Design an enzyme around this catalytic site. Structure first.
Site, PDB file in Angstrom:
ATOM      1  CB  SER A   1       3.202   0.149   6.760  1.00 55.99           C
ATOM      2  OG  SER A   1       1.911   0.663   7.009  1.00 55.99           O
TER       3      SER A   1
ATOM      4  CG  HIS B   1      -0.234  -0.081   2.516  1.00 52.73           C
ATOM      5  ND1 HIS B   1       0.241  -1.268   3.029  1.00 52.73           N
ATOM      6  CD2 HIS B   1       0.079   0.874   3.421  1.00 52.73           C
ATOM      7  CE1 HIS B   1       0.819  -1.040   4.195  1.00 52.73           C
ATOM      8  NE2 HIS B   1       0.732   0.251   4.457  1.00 52.73           N
TER       9      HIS B   1
ATOM     10  CG  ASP C   1      -2.257  -5.722   1.708  1.00 53.70           C
ATOM     11  OD1 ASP C   1      -2.761  -5.839   0.573  1.00 53.70           O
ATOM     12  OD2 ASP C   1      -2.937  -5.589   2.747  1.00 53.70           O
TER      13      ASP C   1
END
Ligand code: PCW
Lengths: 151, 48, 52, 151
Positions: free
Chosen positions: D103, D29, D51
């Site tokens: 992240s 992402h 992801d």
């Protein structure tokens, strides 16, 4: 220790032949004649797959061959040029520890038994991944990390 | 001509078995590919 | 012309579906560190390991 | 903490890549150009299901590769915003510890290996559940809670 023999060339040593069990280990890429006269006369069966040359030890007179083993628990080992550390499926050393011309050097465990014979190494920056000829329970194996050059 | 027209539709002769063979082969290949796709899709959908 | 065109397009769709199946059945093994792809699956999906 | 192998990938810092095992791993992402100006030139395989996105680590920085493992016993693990606890099949952090842009932070066991990579998470009051990718034996997985969002 001291059971190994240098394979000699015209003016320098290019590799090292090790005595393990009942076989005269010798890497195949290195070329020479071996120092000791009798050992030079044995029939060396080769294999480009494992880059090895081995022959039956004259065990009637050579009763000093190094002990061997098949298990490789992760830890620390020594190879007469320092200490080799195990991780995953690679052998790593300080970058400058390994040098060309000393291929075929046996590497031992803490109990004085060989587990692998180094063929070459790839400089990974801080560490050097070793390309070695080891053996599992039954048969030999050639672990070759990426970009490993012969020694 | 005493007879009628040849035929308004798909009255090709026997030895259209060539058409049947090629269509069947292509259909077999497509069916195999679809089966592989669906089996790997089922395997990947089971995985989580 | 129509029959030849669609049939080759059908085999193209079949090969595309095969490629998509290979991608979706091989990427899990590609992402995972360790690279323990079995010999059988390497031969079936036509891939090679990093030690060969 | 005691080992640096992470790299950011954008001028506006949002997400980070890691040198885990033999793969450079970055969640999907997040967008950007991985720094050092060679890793971003690598060929990256991605999977929107997990992801995740990966690439082979160049031989130059194999020494910088972080150790990793697959076992996740119940306990406490540490990341760069403090500590986490893998309690009851979930990774949870105290509320407010994480925020957008986090992240790609790995999660370490006490021995320094990597066992997780954070993508985001959701909060239930004082606590916060995490959305994380992890690898069991031979296969990676992704675990997500209810009402999470990307970080
Ligand atoms: C992605 C791509 C998509 C693009 C779509 C493509 C669309 C292209 C087409 C448009 C259609 C063109 C039609 C032109 C207008 C012709 C009209 C006509 O006047 O139509 C003549 C008749 C059809 O009669 P009707 O049913 O319409 O009348 C009934 C009429 N209604 C139904 C209203 C009651 O046609 C006949 O009868 C003639 C019979 C002669 C039969 C010839 C046989 C040819 C066979 C070849 C086989 C090859 C050998 C195989 C070997 C292979 C070995 C590997």
């Amino acid at each position: 220790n001291d059971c190994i023999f240098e394979v000699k060339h015209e003016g320098k040593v290019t590799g090292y032949a090790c005595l393990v069990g009942d076989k005269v280990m010798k890497p195949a890429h290195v070329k020479g004649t071996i120092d000791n006269a009798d050992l030079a006369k044995l029939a060396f069966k080769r294999s480009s797959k494992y880059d090895l040359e081995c022959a039956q030890i004259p065990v009637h007179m050579k009763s000093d061959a190094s002990k061997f083993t098949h298990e490789k628990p992760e830890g620390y080992y020594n190879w007469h040029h320092g200490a080799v550390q195990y991780s995953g499926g690679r052998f790593t050393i300080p970058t400058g520890a390994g040098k060309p011309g000393d291929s075929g050097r046996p590497i031992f465990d803490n109990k004085g038994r060989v587990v692998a014979i180094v063929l070459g190494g790839a400089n990974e920056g801080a560490r050097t991944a070793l390309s070695v000829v080891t053996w599992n329970k039954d048969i030999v194996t050639k672990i070759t990390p990426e970009g490993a050059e012969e020694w | 001509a005493s007879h009628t027209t040849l035929g308004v539709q798909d009255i090709s002769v026997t030895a259209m078995s060539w058409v049947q063979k090629i269509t069947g082969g292509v259909g077999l290949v497509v069916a195999v590919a679809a089966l592989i796709l669906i089996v790997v899709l089922c395997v990947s959908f089971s995985r989580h | 012309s129509v029959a030849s065109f669609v049939l080759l397009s059908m085999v193209g769709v079949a090969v595309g579906m095969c490629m998509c199946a290979r991608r979706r059945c091989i990427t899990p093994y590609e992402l995972t560190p360790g690279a323990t792809v079995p010999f059988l699956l390497s031969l079936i999906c036509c891939i090679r390991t990093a030690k060969a």
